[PDB]
Design a protein around this ligand. Structure first.
Ligand SMILES: [Mg+2]
Ligand SMILES: [Mg+2]
Ligand SMILES: [Mg+2]
Ligand SMILES: [Mg+2]
Ligand SMILES: [Mg+2]
Ligand SMILES: [Mg+2]
Ligand SMILES: [Mg+2]
Ligand SMILES: [Mg+2]
Ligand SMILES: [Mg+2]
Ligand SMILES: [Mg+2]
Ligand SMILES: [Mg+2]
Ligand SMILES: [Mg+2]
Ligand SMILES: [Mg+2]
Ligand SMILES: [Mg+2]
Ligand SMILES: [Mg+2]
Ligand SMILES: [Mg+2]
Ligand SMILES: [Mg+2]
Ligand SMILES: [Mg+2]
Ligand SMILES: [Mg+2]
Ligand SMILES: [Mg+2]
Ligand SMILES: [Mg+2]
Ligand SMILES: [Mg+2]
Ligand SMILES: [Mg+2]
Ligand SMILES: [Mg+2]
Ligand SMILES: [Mg+2]
Ligand SMILES: [Mg+2]
Ligand SMILES: [Mg+2]
Ligand SMILES: [Mg+2]
Ligand SMILES: [Mg+2]
Ligand SMILES: [Mg+2]
Ligand SMILES: [Mg+2]
Ligand SMILES: [Mg+2]
Ligand SMILES: [Mg+2]
Ligand SMILES: [Mg+2]
Ligand SMILES: [Mg+2]
Ligand SMILES: [Mg+2]
Ligand SMILES: [Mg+2]
Ligand SMILES: [Mg+2]
Ligand SMILES: [Mg+2]
Ligand SMILES: [Mg+2]
Ligand SMILES: [Mg+2]
Ligand SMILES: [Mg+2]
Ligand SMILES: [Mg+2]
Ligand SMILES: [Mg+2]
Ligand SMILES: [Mg+2]
Ligand SMILES: [Mg+2]
Ligand SMILES: [Mg+2]
Ligand SMILES: [Mg+2]
Ligand SMILES: [Mg+2]
Ligand SMILES: [Mg+2]
Ligand SMILES: [Mg+2]
Ligand SMILES: [Mg+2]
Ligand SMILES: [Mg+2]
Ligand SMILES: [Mg+2]
Ligand SMILES: [Mg+2]
Ligand SMILES: [Mg+2]
Ligand SMILES: [Mg+2]
Ligand SMILES: [Mg+2]
Ligand SMILES: [Mg+2]
Ligand SMILES: [Mg+2]
Ligand SMILES: [Mg+2]
Ligand SMILES: [Mg+2]
Ligand SMILES: [Mg+2]
Ligand SMILES: [Mg+2]
Ligand SMILES: [Mg+2]
Ligand SMILES: [Mg+2]
Ligand SMILES: [Mg+2]
Ligand SMILES: [Mg+2]
Ligand SMILES: [Mg+2]
Ligand SMILES: [Mg+2]
Ligand SMILES: [Mg+2]
Ligand SMILES: [Mg+2]
Ligand SMILES: [Mg+2]
Ligand SMILES: [Mg+2]
Ligand SMILES: [Mg+2]
Ligand SMILES: [Mg+2]
Ligand SMILES: [Mg+2]
Ligand SMILES: [Mg+2]
Ligand SMILES: [Mg+2]
Ligand SMILES: [Mg+2]
Ligand SMILES: [Mg+2]
Ligand SMILES: [Mg+2]
Ligand SMILES: [Mg+2]
Ligand SMILES: [Mg+2]
Ligand SMILES: [Mg+2]
Ligand SMILES: [Mg+2]
Ligand SMILES: [Mg+2]
Ligand SMILES: [Mg+2]
Ligand SMILES: [Mg+2]
Ligand SMILES: [Mg+2]
Ligand SMILES: [Mg+2]
Ligand SMILES: [Mg+2]
Ligand SMILES: [Mg+2]
Ligand SMILES: [Mg+2]
Ligand SMILES: [Mg+2]
Ligand SMILES: [Mg+2]
Ligand SMILES: [Mg+2]
Length: 245
RNA sequence: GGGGCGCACCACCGGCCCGCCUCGCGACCCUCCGGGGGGCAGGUGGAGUUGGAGCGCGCGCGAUGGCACCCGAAAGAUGGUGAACUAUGCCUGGGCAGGGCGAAGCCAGGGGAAACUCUGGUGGAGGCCCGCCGCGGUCCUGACGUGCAAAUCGGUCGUCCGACCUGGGCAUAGGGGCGAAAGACUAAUCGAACCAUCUAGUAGCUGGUUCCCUCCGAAGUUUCCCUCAGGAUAGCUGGCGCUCGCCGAUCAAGCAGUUUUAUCCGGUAAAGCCAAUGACUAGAGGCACCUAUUCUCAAACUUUAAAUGGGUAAGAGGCCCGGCUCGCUGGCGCUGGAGCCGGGCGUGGAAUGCGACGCGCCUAGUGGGCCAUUUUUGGUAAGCAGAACUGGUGCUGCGGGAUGAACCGAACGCCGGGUUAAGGCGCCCGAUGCCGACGCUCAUCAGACCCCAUAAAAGGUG
RNA sequence: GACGCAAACGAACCCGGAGAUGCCGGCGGGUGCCCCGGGAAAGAGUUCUCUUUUCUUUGUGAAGGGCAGGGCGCCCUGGAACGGGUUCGCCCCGAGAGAGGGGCCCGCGCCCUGGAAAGCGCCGCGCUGCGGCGUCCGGUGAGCUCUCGUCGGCCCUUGAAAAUCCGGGGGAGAAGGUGUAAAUCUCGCGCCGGGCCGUACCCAUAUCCGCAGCAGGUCUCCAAGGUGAACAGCCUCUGGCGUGUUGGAACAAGGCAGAGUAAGGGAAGUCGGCAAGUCAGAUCCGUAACUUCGGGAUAAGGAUUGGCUCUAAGGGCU
RNA sequence: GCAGCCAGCUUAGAACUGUCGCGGACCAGGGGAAUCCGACUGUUUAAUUAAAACAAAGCAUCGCGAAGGCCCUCGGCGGGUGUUGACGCGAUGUGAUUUCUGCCCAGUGCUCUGAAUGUCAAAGUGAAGAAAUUCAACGAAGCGCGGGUAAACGGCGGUCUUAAGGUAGCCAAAUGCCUCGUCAUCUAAUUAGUGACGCGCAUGAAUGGAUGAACGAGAUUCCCACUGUCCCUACCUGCUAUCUAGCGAAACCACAGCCAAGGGAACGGGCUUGGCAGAAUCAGCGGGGAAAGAAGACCCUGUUGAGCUUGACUCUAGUCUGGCCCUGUGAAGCCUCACUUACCCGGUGAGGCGGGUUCUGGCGUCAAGCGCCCCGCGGGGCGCGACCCGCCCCGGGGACAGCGUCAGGUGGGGAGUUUGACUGGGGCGGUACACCUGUCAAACGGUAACGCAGGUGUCCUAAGGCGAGCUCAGGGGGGACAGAAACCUCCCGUAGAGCAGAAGGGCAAAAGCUCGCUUGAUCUUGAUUUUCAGUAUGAGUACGGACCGCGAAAGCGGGGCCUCACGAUCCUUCCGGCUUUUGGGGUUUUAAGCGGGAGGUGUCAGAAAAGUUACCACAGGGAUAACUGGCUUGUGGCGGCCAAGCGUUCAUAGCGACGUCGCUUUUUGAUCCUUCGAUGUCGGCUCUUCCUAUCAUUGUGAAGCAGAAUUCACCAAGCGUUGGAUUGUUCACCCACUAACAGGGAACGUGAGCUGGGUUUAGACCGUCGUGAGACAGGUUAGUUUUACCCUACUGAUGUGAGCCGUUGUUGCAAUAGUAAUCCCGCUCAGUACGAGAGGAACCGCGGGUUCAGACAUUUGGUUCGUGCGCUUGGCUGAGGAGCCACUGGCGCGAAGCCACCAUCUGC
């Protein structure tokens, strides 16, 4: 047979992301002295739309403490923030929606967003629209804090991980049922070339292990092992269970 | 007319050498620690030996490895070149009459006790409608179909603000790409592009394989083979000889797809079942059976038993006699037996024919056969399928059967004369143009000769 | 006050602007074109009859100055309910309407410099270039384009970067000591320079690709009059052209096309209403089953349609 | 409060008016009632499939928190997703909405455990041994075991029964073979359509079920309207064809080109026997040249491929896991926890590490200030402001990730290869593939077929060897229980029993039975028979040499009474040998070798081996299938003979049982002779001729013929044999009509004649089947039908006896060839014959018609580019007038021509 569609996406020729009109990488201000021993005052300049994501981005303007300059940061817009408000980032920052402060300095049950997975990575978790992370518990002895991720998973992270207080703006985006295939065309035209998905049963055996036969049946158990080779790992990869549930 | 030395070669019997086996095991001069010998004999294995024949060169042919007689694949591999077509994506540009339905929003006026409703207008939303350009390509299965065109033309038709159309610049490259998925597209090439090379790839498979004359002349069968379109092998074929015989007296041997004589072998035809095994019909007698009869049968039944056929023997390699040898055999060195040696006796002791189809070596082709009389299996039968003997044919023309592969006659250098075969002799068309013999036969579908080109049961006061 | 003055020092560094923002709809301003009236001038066409007629020509570059016109969430005064202003739609208003008076931007429109000297039109003379006259005055529009605006609509779509240029913040610095100096973004003026490469032509029913002068393919710009809803079809002007690799003569069969026509019947043809026939535009009426209430729908089914002569209504301006 | 002036363009109404004509040209939806499928728009096989296929929104599941999921790369812990972060990315299924989505976790697969008993690599560990080595313990992942999971693949039965037994629904469906199901409806008639019925060959619930507005160049049925689709064709125009001037190919070609029969490679053009036969040509035409185009694409074969799939064979990338390696340090009880410096990751312009500014959508830029010091009031430096020290920039991991290297598992993701043969084509079946008996087999031997009837891959320490004794099968007479069969006994008993087995042979003091002694079923050499090449192996025979058994002995026995019961090389294994080598010697292990067994190749002289291809390819094959033709005629069809019987009686008016003889090639087979470098394949349409086994008509005979009607038979193919519904249909069935609605042939006539409905490429759907790719001889939908100008034949059209007193013309003759008419009705006969009636003819005569033939245009109708006349739309020449343009602008009428059973005439 030939190389299946799923394998051709790793070479990245026509499957690369469409990043022409994107405004930049949304990430927290990198950890410095002002965020380890205090807070820095930042003004929200504009809340812009990032092509490819349903979550708006805030252009928060900060002031460089070592040189006379104004640092422009592209944060994940927390739902509720607005242009003209002051966003405070640091250890001594107050618990307000939009502020950035470590998880160790926030009480249990605090709803946060743009949460750092490791101290300094400038935000990795809870970045999509309407999502958030809850601070479950703390541990001052080990300086570790337990948080709840939007997938229901509970991860033990460091207490120095910075996060934005609040929920990511643009919530409820998946609640509007797309009606036209054209709206799905434009939805993925800004993200990547992945929208029109031909079924493997609708192909020939040369390009998919589910194709072929005088009917469009799968023919083989759709649940495939995890150690299956690339080109065979299609269907339900390492499915623990199936059915309506 | 007698004797003899006997070449080469062949048959047989020995001797010896090496391997192996069995038997015999012993005292002894080579033991000098260790050890080497000890007629050993009787068998058997060996590509040995018993008075070398090879080596080199050349020539011819055969079977091989090689491009291997020539041309031919579908492929496989290595390296490379293409996204000017097209597929998708990216970037930056360009483009899409006039109408139709007419949503939210808004205005005003009616109805109502209120909740609120009703009407008109406005408004201009939509993968909305008609439709031009554009982009597509439904039907006519129209035109065309060596065309205008290696996909075009006409009318008709789909869509025509959207998942729209489109340029340029970019990206993805061959087991890779790309694919709203047709195995589609990737430069007229796609169920794996193109180019060059490996490569003159291999082919048990088609095709072709070049001058003459002369001579000889097949096989389609055996066994084996992942064989059954091929090979190996035997047979059939040719060539090369050679050993002789005739020369030197059918001298005689020897031989034979043939008889004769003698001697065996067989279980088929026929026959038989009142004989066995099995099948089967009918009465009859006796105290369903039992006895004597009876009808009808066998390929896997048979007492009996041919024709044709198979083997063997028809002499000097015989016959007769004597002596000798033996470890085998044993009442009996003659009891067997066999071997060795010598002597005696042609009236070569059936017919016919023939030089020995003698002894070798090398060897091509073939290993699809087909047909006829007879025999014979399966089948309703077949110009069917499968066997047996022989001939034919393939390979073969000629006379005849009009015609023809195979029937009939007869096989062939180039001719003249003669005469025939099979078949014919009204005319075509050589030959009855006989005063041919006797009879049969009338058909309003007559009849007219192997194979052979169809005719039956049953009928006629012809 | 918005902001204006020919200029009107100023670095490092910082901030911001322009470059630099999609598609669609409505409306408005301006050109171009088209159209109407001059009983307008200059030639021309017709003049059998009629036609104060028909046709053609009646213009001004860049840049600069001035002024219409358009735009402005720009300013000042002031204060709104009996709310008012206002658009086709909307929208706007004590975060300040209306009104009054200003300011700014765009002005591709008009006038002027250019610049009538040139260009067109007409007439005249000369020859084998010189002169004359004219180049005028208006009307409009559901008109068509282009463009500048404005207000919206749409997106689970938000519709580029950079070179370059500019403003501000900054006040580090520079300048002279009584008339000048430093400094000058003064289209105030003068002086000098701007190299290299492409540039013809075809651009398609004969200059490209398809082997060709191939009915194929190949990205754009400009675009008139009449009919009409139309960038439809049909006709005409400007421009182009000889009918698309040949002529002549016949008009048989059989073809291809004209989607030619055909009495009576009307799908009996045929696998099958294949084929083309019917219907068709517009106006006025009338529109079911079913439904996701959106539709179905131009459902279906009707009537009307010419020409001519009138009536009525729908405007603007002083 | 308007008067004056200016400015258009629409709308409504009315009169009048022409031939009731007017969106006059042009432009420009036929409609309705239903079924199926897909929701829709969109997309798709460039060059045969625009679709019901793909996509789609929606729905659902799966994976994954980044040291990650998915994927790329030869490789860098490089790259894509990712300028991403679960409202995300990645992998699948289903396919809008509505309505539901049942049961099954046994199987397969996925996944989760590890109170995990097994299986279990490398390394490490222990023991034995001179050591190589052997043995043992230990023993990861995975497997096994256990649980979960079906919107995972899939499945969802006849008291039996499993894993669940098809639930809601739906249906003779795009799914039902039987089948053209049954009923209803739709029509005169319906294999169609629709609605029902459902044990449904073989429906069914996200392999989604049911429904469904809107939509569709989708499939189907009906109705209205409409029409040349047809009845039934005709006329006109343009461009051609045609002729001409100029110009000027190609395909194709053994030679060629009249037929009938014959035979032949079984369908000649040439050959045979006949018919016969006259230059040179034109326009047509499509019968033939088994016409051309193309080394059949179907089929088979080849030890030729390729695409693709799996539970094929053998590997492999990746991945999982273990050991070693970078890999060090500290502590505690191999394991755990710590250490940082290896290594790894993250952040940053490496900007503050360790120890001692929240009151606003301002502003913040190289230090003010102070202290100290140096230049000649201008100038400069330094320090504090801005604390000191420090060894690693700051975080997060950490000797774990990860790299390297072996080891185990997984691995159709990928690679390579295979997937027997025989065979009345192949496949399926079977084994005729290695053997044995009888027969075939034709009296030596041998002798074939997918001939016949059978057997074999064993069995036996005796069922081998030997000796002795005994006699069997069966029948009869008898004899307590005891009988048709228990046991005793007598007589008869050629074997008719038994001998392991198939059958044949052989066997009576044996070869059978019984008994007691045994291991000749042992060890060896060669010869030899059978199969045979006269090779091997297997299976036999006769000996010789050993050592034995049994018997008193002669003797018998080296397996089975005989004919069957079996296996090369290589390798492994075992046994045997004072006997070899282990090589520079010696010793000892090991290894090798020699001799003999065993381990096995059943395709049995012995490869290690699953499919599919309708996406297919190549070399070939008429050695071999699917057509026609040929042979044959079982079968099908048709006709006889005999005469039991039927016919009230009466065999034979008409029939014909049991039997039997034929014919025919319009059935189907059998065969495989022709054709695979191709003979175009079903049906219909069209058109011609032929056969008679005669439906009708003509002339007859017969009757269980009164008439009428009908039946049987004869001469006889002259003439006719229809229009429709359904189905692609030949074949059926029905509706009507009719004198009758007879059956056939001609390559199962006829595709360069047509039409493609069907079959029979590639698209796609359903059901069943298969794990799958795929299959269906099941259904369904869409799917390029190319070329003639050559030679004949035929159709017409020119011309033709090259020699002559012939040339030329008129009127004619005529061989030969073609040939043509046909059937019906009405009146009359006549309500008559006939008959009891009911009913009910015929000849002559008369008047018409059907089908056909040949004409013809007076009439009617059609056509009209005489572009003849009128009218008229848009435009154009200024207008009138007169005209033109729109490939014939349109409309009405229309001459002449041509033309219609749509008008007319004639047919012996
Ligand atoms: Mg895509
Ligand atoms: Mg999806
Ligand atoms: Mg899909
Ligand atoms: Mg497909
Ligand atoms: Mg499949
Ligand atoms: Mg599906
Ligand atoms: Mg499916
Ligand atoms: Mg001698
Ligand atoms: Mg290969
Ligand atoms: Mg593209
Ligand atoms: Mg169009
Ligand atoms: Mg077309
Ligand atoms: Mg269609
Ligand atoms: Mg059609
Ligand atoms: Mg066509
Ligand atoms: Mg043609
Ligand atoms: Mg482009
Ligand atoms: Mg390739
Ligand atoms: Mg396919
Ligand atoms: Mg060669
Ligand atoms: Mg051959
Ligand atoms: Mg030979
Ligand atoms: Mg041979
Ligand atoms: Mg035969
Ligand atoms: Mg011969
Ligand atoms: Mg001969
Ligand atoms: Mg003859
Ligand atoms: Mg003769
Ligand atoms: Mg008779
Ligand atoms: Mg300043
Ligand atoms: Mg606008
Ligand atoms: Mg400044
Ligand atoms: Mg130029
Ligand atoms: Mg062209
Ligand atoms: Mg116009
Ligand atoms: Mg235009
Ligand atoms: Mg127009
Ligand atoms: Mg011309
Ligand atoms: Mg031309
Ligand atoms: Mg017509
Ligand atoms: Mg008509
Ligand atoms: Mg019909
Ligand atoms: Mg019909
Ligand atoms: Mg049609
Ligand atoms: Mg309707
Ligand atoms: Mg669709
Ligand atoms: Mg649906
Ligand atoms: Mg569509
Ligand atoms: Mg196509
Ligand atoms: Mg379509
Ligand atoms: Mg589908
Ligand atoms: Mg749904
Ligand atoms: Mg599923
Ligand atoms: Mg399970
Ligand atoms: Mg299945
Ligand atoms: Mg049920
Ligand atoms: Mg019908
Ligand atoms: Mg039904
Ligand atoms: Mg099912
Ligand atoms: Mg289910
Ligand atoms: Mg199903
Ligand atoms: Mg469609
Ligand atoms: Mg011929
Ligand atoms: Mg040919
Ligand atoms: Mg071939
Ligand atoms: Mg073979
Ligand atoms: Mg292969
Ligand atoms: Mg392939
Ligand atoms: Mg494979
Ligand atoms: Mg075979
Ligand atoms: Mg014999
Ligand atoms: Mg034996
Ligand atoms: Mg060893
Ligand atoms: Mg074999
Ligand atoms: Mg043959
Ligand atoms: Mg019969
Ligand atoms: Mg009787
Ligand atoms: Mg009978
Ligand atoms: Mg042909
Ligand atoms: Mg041929
Ligand atoms: Mg032919
Ligand atoms: Mg007859
Ligand atoms: Mg009779
Ligand atoms: Mg026939
Ligand atoms: Mg035929
Ligand atoms: Mg034909
Ligand atoms: Mg054809
Ligand atoms: Mg046909
Ligand atoms: Mg078809
Ligand atoms: Mg198909
Ligand atoms: Mg079809
Ligand atoms: Mg189609
Ligand atoms: Mg007339
Ligand atoms: Mg007019
Ligand atoms: Mg006029
Ligand atoms: Mg016209
Ligand atoms: Mg007329």
């Amino acid at each position: 047979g030939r190389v299946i569609r799923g394998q051709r996406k790793g070479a990245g020729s026509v499957f690369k992301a469409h990043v022409k009109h994107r405004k930049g990488a949304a990430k927290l201000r990198h950890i410095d002295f002002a965020e380890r021993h205090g807070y820095i005052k930042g003004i929200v300049k504009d809340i812009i739309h990032d092509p490819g994501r349903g979550a708006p981005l805030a252009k928060v303007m900060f002031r460089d403490p070592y040189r006379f300059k104004k640092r422009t940061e592209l944060f994940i817009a927390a739902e509720g923030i607005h242009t003209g408000q002051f966003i405070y980032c640091g250890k001594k920052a107050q618990l307000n929606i939009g502020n950035v402060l470590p998880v160790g300095t926030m009480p249990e049950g605090t709803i946060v967003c743009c949460l750092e997975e490791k101290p300094g990575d400038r935000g990795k978790l809870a970045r999509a629209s309407g999502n958030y992370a809850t601070v479950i518990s703390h541990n001052p002895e080990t300086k570790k804090s337990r948080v709840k991720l939007p997938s229901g998973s509970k991860k033990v992270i460091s207490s120095a991980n910075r996060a934005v207080v609040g929920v990511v703006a643009g919530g409820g985006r998946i609640d509007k049922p797309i009606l036209k295939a054209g709206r799905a065309y434009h939805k993925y035209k800004a993200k990547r070339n992945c929208w029109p998905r031909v079924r493997g049963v609708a192909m020939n055996p040369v390009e998919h292990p589910f194709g072929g036969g005088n009917h469009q049946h799968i023919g083989k158990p759709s649940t495939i092992r995890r150690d299956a080779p690339a080109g065979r790992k299609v269907g339900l990869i390492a499915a623990r269970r199936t059915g309506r549930l």
